[PDB]
Design an enzyme around this catalytic site. Structure first.
Site, mmCIF file in Angstrom:
data_model
loop_
_atom_site.group_PDB
_atom_site.id
_atom_site.type_symbol
_atom_site.label_atom_id
_atom_site.label_comp_id
_atom_site.label_asym_id
_atom_site.label_seq_id
_atom_site.Cartn_x
_atom_site.Cartn_y
_atom_site.Cartn_z
ATOM 1 N N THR A 122 0.821 -1.204 0.000
ATOM 2 C CA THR A 122 0.000 0.000 0.000
ATOM 3 C C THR A 122 0.855 1.255 0.000
ATOM 4 O O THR A 122 1.595 1.515 0.949
ATOM 5 C CB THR A 122 -0.938 0.043 1.213
ATOM 6 O OG1 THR A 122 -1.762 -1.128 1.221
ATOM 7 C CG2 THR A 122 -1.813 1.288 1.165
ATOM 8 N N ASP A 145 -2.150 2.213 -5.087
ATOM 9 C CA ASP A 145 -1.836 0.865 -5.548
ATOM 10 C C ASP A 145 -2.742 -0.119 -4.817
ATOM 11 O O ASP A 145 -3.023 0.061 -3.632
ATOM 12 C CB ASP A 145 -0.351 0.532 -5.328
ATOM 13 C CG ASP A 145 0.113 0.779 -3.905
ATOM 14 O OD1 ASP A 145 -0.615 1.413 -3.115
ATOM 15 O OD2 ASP A 145 1.226 0.324 -3.562
ATOM 16 N N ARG A 190 -3.104 -3.548 -3.968
ATOM 17 C CA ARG A 190 -2.873 -4.889 -3.454
ATOM 18 C C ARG A 190 -3.328 -4.884 -2.004
ATOM 19 O O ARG A 190 -2.657 -4.312 -1.140
ATOM 20 C CB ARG A 190 -1.411 -5.295 -3.558
ATOM 21 C CG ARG A 190 -1.119 -6.676 -3.050
ATOM 22 C CD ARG A 190 0.358 -6.938 -3.171
ATOM 23 N NE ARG A 190 0.764 -7.066 -4.564
ATOM 24 C CZ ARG A 190 2.027 -7.119 -4.967
ATOM 25 N NH1 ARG A 190 3.010 -7.049 -4.082
ATOM 26 N NH2 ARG A 190 2.310 -7.243 -6.255
ATOM 27 N N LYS A 241 -8.915 2.066 -3.413
ATOM 28 C CA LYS A 241 -8.450 2.783 -2.240
ATOM 29 C C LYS A 241 -8.738 4.274 -2.299
ATOM 30 O O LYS A 241 -8.578 4.962 -1.286
ATOM 31 C CB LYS A 241 -6.953 2.529 -2.049
ATOM 32 C CG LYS A 241 -6.663 1.098 -1.601
ATOM 33 C CD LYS A 241 -5.194 0.870 -1.307
ATOM 34 C CE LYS A 241 -4.955 -0.548 -0.803
ATOM 35 N NZ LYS A 241 -5.584 -0.774 0.530
ATOM 36 N N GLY A 252 -3.646 1.223 5.900
ATOM 37 C CA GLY A 252 -3.672 0.510 7.166
ATOM 38 C C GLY A 252 -4.886 -0.380 7.207
ATOM 39 O O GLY A 252 -5.120 -1.165 6.283
ATOM 40 N N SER A 301 2.677 1.663 3.589
ATOM 41 C CA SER A 301 3.855 0.897 3.971
ATOM 42 C C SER A 301 5.052 1.196 3.085
ATOM 43 O O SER A 301 6.181 1.290 3.577
ATOM 44 C CB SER A 301 3.547 -0.600 3.918
ATOM 45 O OG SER A 301 3.353 -1.027 2.581
ATOM 46 N N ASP A 359 9.081 -2.970 -2.011
ATOM 47 C CA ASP A 359 8.322 -4.123 -1.558
ATOM 48 C C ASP A 359 6.907 -3.714 -1.170
ATOM 49 O O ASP A 359 6.655 -2.566 -0.792
ATOM 50 C CB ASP A 359 9.033 -4.784 -0.381
ATOM 51 C CG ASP A 359 8.549 -6.191 -0.113
ATOM 52 O OD1 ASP A 359 7.682 -6.687 -0.863
ATOM 53 O OD2 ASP A 359 9.043 -6.804 0.855
ATOM 54 N N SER A 396 1.924 -3.143 -5.667
ATOM 55 C CA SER A 396 0.800 -3.893 -6.200
ATOM 56 C C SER A 396 1.130 -4.365 -7.606
ATOM 57 O O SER A 396 1.917 -3.743 -8.318
ATOM 58 C CB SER A 396 -0.483 -3.056 -6.247
ATOM 59 O OG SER A 396 -0.389 -2.058 -7.241
#
Lengths: 191, 204, 230, 220, 239, 240
Positions: D1, D17, D19, D33, D47, D129, D166, D169
């Site tokens: 994210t 993104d 995922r 999102k 989150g 993240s 890392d 998505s």
């Protein structure tokens, strides 16, 4: 983090860094750390952010409502008492390093300090923030009673400069505020 | 975990014009099974089922609570319910226990009430919806059914190959799973009819 | 000298304090609303008392959602209250179901609210009759309520001064099959039957409901249309 | 994210993104999102997903209510005040990492919200993240008052770097552009990652599975 | 008629209720006159004082109540209802400022005050606050505003505005005066306000009886005029 | 004459008769005046002994609300006691919440709202009191206010509450009120109270005088009236 307030004869002079960090990452590089409440009274904050923001909004509410109902400009000690009550009531939940300053028509320029506990005291100068210990080291060395405005600006400039230089959490950019009978003077310095 | 207290696995898969949902049969405490005829797929109106996995208490409790609210909705309005409406209803019901949460992962699979459009979605334990196009899974075992369905899914599927695909996926992912097994029930529905088949799974 | 108050029935008749509220509705400003094949037309009759008032401040035609119109014939000060209640209630439905509320469910819940105020025994009823409409699932609707908690379903109706006369014109003039423009034409005809002689771009105030959504028309196109429409 | 925000010469360009991981396994490949608030104000979440979803739907309901009661276009600062008051009222229990952006009469205004209640007005934010890679691209190549395609390339580049770092998505990075008049919203913007073609055929046959008990139920 | 002796708030036959249309002249027991005018980018309040006593003060007889820093008002009718309504207005404006982060427009404030009066009207066992309130304020993208709030909860707002005792006559003069399409260059507004009150009451008096509250789109703060400049306007219209 | 029963109802001509009847309740009460000077506010109450059963020092209508504010009530005494307790409570909240002395305008507005709130509803009656409020401050000067039974609260230089409301202010207003310090105003109030009703309807009365201003350095207390004894040696010279 590092916040500072010095009064002089005509009025008061404030100052802060910005650099709000979380852990070891800087979340925000430039921040209005000092907050207008009334047109002549400021407060500058430290510690946690959401606590001081919510407290400053409610104090802005109560103080604006009270000073409109008086139909007179408010006192500084009034706002200090309001911050004292709201800090002391939830010391179990708040982390406020609120420092109140501002010029007053009846009493001139004043500086009040409210640390993490909730006590209220009148001082001629104040420190605040985790990286304030150092300029608190020499603020009893370089300070002279009865400065001018420019001496206070140069003083706090050297102060916040060294605080930003030394502490890891402190840094960013220097914001100043000059409150007197005449006007409100904010500026953005670097050096 | 608490999700692995009674086991459980629910798979739903969207086909071309039809949709297939399947689940396991086993009921038991952490390592001791009791019965093979525990119901986890409930009828909610016509051509639309729901599957529940996790703690069986929250399965039957949320199923009866949802049937309560569902019949109140279908009696206040003479029409039948759209699946997005049901999804939002389950989301509101789960989010009312934000800090008192149920331990369940509901899976909704149903058709369109006007057209023959299929529909699948799944929710989390606090009410996080997720609409997809291929398949959704829930329960204790996840990676097994993800690997199987990402191995075997095709976009345009006749209902027979749909039945065989969900059959092979459930059989292999359940036979590799430990706490969830002891038979498989499969509901394969479409516009015309409703088919329910039970497979000869390994009783081990 | 009886009935007085709201807790006890008459010797034989009805609820005199609701009948008086209905009379206060019938003594109000006129309005007309017509359900056509594709859309619903609402129209009110809004005369300022003097030449001083502004026509951009108070609004009769008022949306409840983006596709649900609503007018009244009664008192604005109660109208705004139950409007705000219907606002909050429709947004609560959209919180629960994440879908725009159907008009029948609106009329059920608004009728429940009005009925709850008709219950005993210190509050007065509303002096407000609604005309609710909306385009839910293709077929548009039209629902009239009343202070008594009841509701109906109309093809075309009226409320206010000379609603009987306007309704006898509606029975003769209107039919089953029209479009929105012909509906506005017959609506301004039946409102012009009963209103004062000076009808301008501000004395009326008209909102429509296409299937593309609610639309509250402007004084520009209202003045363009009623510039001697017949 | 990895969500991001920026202010160009007229409005705001947001990216995301999609995922939605559940633990260690990719649970979703397409999760919206970018959430609705108003015709001019949008919001992104990070989150805990359902917390962001329910909170943003409540605040969008409250602003729809207020705007229909008022009769004009909403302001961003009211949304900010409601969000910070709500999240402080939950005492930081609810984790909802929000990015708030909209264009008022005063112009573009960007706010980022940390789940305790700390808010900031910024020209550019990153949240999530893998926000650090997009913040790297922003701090490298930002200048004030960019143009439209310049800002779109920058935000796409930032979220693309977040995907090459890392927990990005597979998705085809979502964008949305808000101006003073023109709202745009673009789901399949750029697809870098095509799925590999099947090499055979693991198709089952009509009867390869033993059946114990059948049922047929007709309908209408 | 009644008959029913109209003691509580119910509906009478044919068809009105008598409590609110008795409250509409609780203004008329005030013995007072108020005039508001909107012509252009300014807005003017004018209201006289009735002080017969030399022992009585002059500063605390003020009816112009500065609600917020950009919103003023004037009150007529009985004093207690007026002052309580004013503190409700200040409290709810501060509530707006707390909840929504910016300064309240004058429309929503009148709506909220009207709703409070309607709730005081809808539920019985409370007196319906028999005072009338006129508001002024500047709004961006709309210019100045003048609004009126009723004791019934019927707000409206319009160009030339008057409430009190003698305002059928004031609105007769304002129909006979706001019909010519000239602009209103702020001294046109002050002159027409002073002369409309000077033709309704027909007194032509000292600068120490009327109170003038103005607001202008050059200084959006609410502003109360001084005896010197009131005298300046009064002799400026003296021909 | 109606329609005079409830405090919520209106009249066919639009006023509340409960409030009028409560206003003229205080008219039968004792005469109480007040006046301010350029550095203080002076109170004075014509107080009467019943026959011979009192103690000259009971039930004093001169209360003492805050450190610098006191009342000069007239009317029903116990209602005035309760209202004085409410005023003490309001000054208590202000001192506890803001750390300095209450301005008299804000205090008077809170008290006026409290009195108005007792005039509003139908369960309760309006108050039967009418009292005075004086103050002094170094940055504000002297302030003397006035609250009717209805709740209309505004300011004066001089006032009178009782029977002789007009008959005191007939000769109150001929005082050169600005140019005098309050130490003259003490015997001035003495002569004003002593003029009205020496022996006519009743037998005997007795004088109390309250006192606030700059000479008390911001304090409010009763005068040592026995000190300088300013009534009687001038009251016996005021009969001719």
């Amino acid at each position: 983090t590092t916040i500072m307030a010095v009064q002089f004869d005509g009025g008061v002079v404030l100052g802060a860094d910005s650099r709000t960090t979380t852990g070891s990452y800087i979340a925000n590089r430039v921040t209005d750390k000092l907050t207008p409440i009334h047109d002549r009274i400021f407060c500058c904050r430290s510690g946690s952010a959401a606590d001081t923001q919510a407290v400053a909004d409610a104090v802005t509410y109560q103080l604006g409502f009270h000073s409109i109902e008086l139909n007179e400009p408010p006192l500084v000690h009034t706002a200090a008492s309001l911050f004292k009550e709201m800090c002391y009531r939830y010391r179990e939940d708040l982390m406020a390093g609120i420092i109140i300053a501002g010029w007053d028509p009846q009493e001139g320029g004043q500086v009040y300090s409210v640390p993490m506990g909730g006590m209220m005291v009148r001082q001629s100068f104040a420190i605040g923030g985790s990286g304030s210990s150092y300029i608190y080291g020499y603020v009893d060395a370089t300070y002279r009673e009865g400065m001018t405005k420019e001496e206070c600006l140069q003083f706090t400039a050297n102060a916040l400069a060294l605080a930003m230089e030394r502490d890891g959490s402190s840094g960013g950019v220097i914001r100043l505020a000059a409150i007197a009978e005449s006007g409100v003077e904010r500026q953005v310095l670097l050096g | 975990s608490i999700m692995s207290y009674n086991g459980g696995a629910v798979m739903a898969m969207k086909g071309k014009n039809c949709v297939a949902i399947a689940a396991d049969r086993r009921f038991g405490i952490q390592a001791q099974m009791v019965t093979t005829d525990f119901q986890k797929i409930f009828p909610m109106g016509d051509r639309l089922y729901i599957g529940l996995a996790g703690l069986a208490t929250d399965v039957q409790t949320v199923a009866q609570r949802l049937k309560f609210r569902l019949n109140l909705y279908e009696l206040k309005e003479g029409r039948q319910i759209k699946p997005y409406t049901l999804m939002s209803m389950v989301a509101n019901l789960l989010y009312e226990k934000r800090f008192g949460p149920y331990y369940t992962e509901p899976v909704i699979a149903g058709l369109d009430p006007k057209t023959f459009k299929p529909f699948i979605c799944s929710l989390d334990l606090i009410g996080c919806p997720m609409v997809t196009d291929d398949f959704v899974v829930s329960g204790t075992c996840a990676e097994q059914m993800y690997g199987m369905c990402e191995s075997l899914w095709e976009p345009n599927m006749d209902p027979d190959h749909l039945f065989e695909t969900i059959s092979q996926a459930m059989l292999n992912a359940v036979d590799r799973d430990a706490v969830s097994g002891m038979g498989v029930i499969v509901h394969i529905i479409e516009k015309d009819k409703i088919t329910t088949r039970t497979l000869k799974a390994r009783m081990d | 000298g009886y009935s007085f108050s709201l807790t006890t029935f008459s010797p034989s008749g009805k609820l005199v304090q609701i009948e008086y509220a209905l009379a206060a509705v019938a003594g109000g400003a006129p309005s007309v609303g017509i359900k056509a094949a594709n859309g619903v037309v609402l129209a009110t009759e809004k005369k300022q008392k003097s030449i001083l008032y502004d026509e951009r401040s108070v609004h009769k035609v008022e949306p409840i959602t983006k596709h649900i119109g609503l007018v009244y014939s009664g008192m604005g000060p109660d109208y705004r209250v139950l409007v705000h209640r219907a606002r909050k209630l429709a947004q609560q439905y959209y919180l629960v179901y994440q879908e725009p509320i159907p008009t029948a469910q609106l009329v059920q819940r608004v009728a429940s609210v009005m009925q709850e105020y008709t219950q005993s025994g210190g509050v007065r009823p509303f002096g407000v009759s609604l005309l609710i409409c909306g385009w839910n699932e293709g077929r548009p609707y039209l629902f009239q309520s009343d202070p008594s908690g009841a509701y109906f379903a109309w093809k075309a109706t009226a409320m206010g001064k000379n609603y009987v006369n306007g309704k006898t014109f509606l029975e003769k003039r209107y039919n089953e099959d029209l479009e929105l423009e012909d509906a506005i034409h017959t609506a301004i005809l039946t409102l012009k039957e009963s209103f004062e002689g000076q009808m301008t771009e501000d004395n009326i105030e008209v909102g429509i409901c296409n299937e593309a959504g609610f639309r509250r028309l402007t004084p520009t196109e209202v003045k363009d249309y009623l510039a001697a429409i017949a | 994210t990895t969500i991001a925000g920026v202010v160009y010469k007229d409005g705001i360009v947001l990216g995301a993104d999609t995922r939605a991981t559940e633990g260690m396994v990719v649970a979703d490949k397409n999760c919206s999102k970018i959430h609705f608030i108003s015709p001019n104000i949008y919001c992104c979440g990070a989150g805990t997903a359902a917390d962001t979803d329910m909170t943003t739907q409540l605040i969008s309901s409250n602003l729809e209510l207020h705007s229909l009661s008022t009769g004009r276009l909403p302001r961003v600062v009211t949304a900010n005040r409601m969000l910070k008051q709500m999240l402080f009222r939950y005492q930081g229990y609810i984790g909802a990492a929000l990015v708030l952006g909209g264009v008022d009469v005063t112009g573009p205004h960007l706010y980022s919200i940390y789940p305790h209640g700390s808010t900031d007005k910024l020209p550019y934010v990153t949240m999530g993240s893998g926000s650090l890679a997009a913040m790297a691209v922003f701090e490298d190549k930002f200048r004030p008052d960019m143009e439209e395609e310049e800002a779109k390339n920058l935000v796409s580049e930032a979220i693309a770097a977040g995907i090459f770092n890392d927990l990005g998505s597979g998705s085809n990075i979502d964008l949305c552009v808000i101006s003073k008049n023109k709202l745009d919203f673009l789901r399949p913007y750029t697809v870098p990652n095509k799925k590999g073609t099947r090499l055979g055929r693991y198709r089952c046959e009509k009867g390869t599975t033993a059946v114990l008990t059948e049922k047929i139920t007709p309908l209408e | 008629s009644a008959g029913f002796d109209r003691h509580i708030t119910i509906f009478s036959p044919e068809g009105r209720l008598y409590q609110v249309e008795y409250a509409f002249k609780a203004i008329n027991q005030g013995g007072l006159t108020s005039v508001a005018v909107r012509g252009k980018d300014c807005a003017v309040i004018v209201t006289q004082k009735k002080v017969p006593d030399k022992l009585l003060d002059s500063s605390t007889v003020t009816h112009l109540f500065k609600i917020t820093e950009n919103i003023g008002c004037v009150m007529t009718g009985m004093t207690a209802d007026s002052r309580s309504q004013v503190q409700r207005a200040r409290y709810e404006a501060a509530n707006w400022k707390y909840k929504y982060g910016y300064e309240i427009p004058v429309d929503m404030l009148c709506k909220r005050i009207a709703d409070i009066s309607q709730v005081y009207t809808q539920n019985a066992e409370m007196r319906p606050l028999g005072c009338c309130m006129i508001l002024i304020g500047i709004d961006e993208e709309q210019g100045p505003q003048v609004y009126k709030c009723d004791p019934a909860g019927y707000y409206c707002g319009f160009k030339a505005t008057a409430a009190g005792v003698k305002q059928t006559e004031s609105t007769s003069f304002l129909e006979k005066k706001v019909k010519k399409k000239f602009d209103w260059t702020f001294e046109q507004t002050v002159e027409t306000a002073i002369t409309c009150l000077s033709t309704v009451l027909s007194i032509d008096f000292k600068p120490s009886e009327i109170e003038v509250g103005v607001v202008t789109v050059e200084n959006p703060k609410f502003r109360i005029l001084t005896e010197a400049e009131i005298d300046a306007h009064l002799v400026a219209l003296a021909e | 004459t109606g329609y005079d029963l409830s405090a919520s109802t209106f009249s066919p001509d639009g006023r509340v008769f409960q409030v009028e009847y409560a206003m003229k309740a205080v008219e039968n009460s004792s005469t109480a005046i007040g006046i301010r000077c350029k550095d203080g506010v002076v109170f004075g109450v014509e107080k009467l002994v019943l026959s011979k059963l009192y103690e000259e020092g009971s039930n004093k209508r001169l209360f003492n609300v805050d450190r610098h504010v006191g009342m000069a009530v007239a009317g029903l005494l116990a209602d005035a006691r309760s209202l004085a307790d409410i005023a003490r409570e309001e000054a208590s909240n202000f001192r506890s919440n803001f750390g300095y002395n209450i301005p008299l305008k804000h205090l008077a507005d809170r008290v006026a709202m409290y009195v108005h709130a007792y005039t509003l509803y139908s369960a309760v009656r309006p108050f039967g009191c009418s009292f005075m409020l004086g103050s002094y401050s170094v940055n504000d000067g002297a302030q003397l206010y006035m609250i009717d039974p209805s709740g209309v609260s505004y300011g004066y230089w001089g006032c009178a509450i009782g029977k002789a409301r007009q008959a005191a202010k007939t000769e109150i207003e001929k005082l050169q009120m600005k140019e005098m310090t309050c130490r003259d105003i003490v015997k001035e109030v003495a002569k004003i109270i002593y003029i009205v009703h020496d022996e006519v309807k009743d037998k005997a009365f007795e004088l109390e005088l309250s006192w606030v201003g700059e000479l008390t350095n911001g304090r409010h207390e009763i005068v040592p009236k026995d000190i300088r004894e300013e009534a009687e040696k001038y009251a016996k010279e005021s009969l001719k």
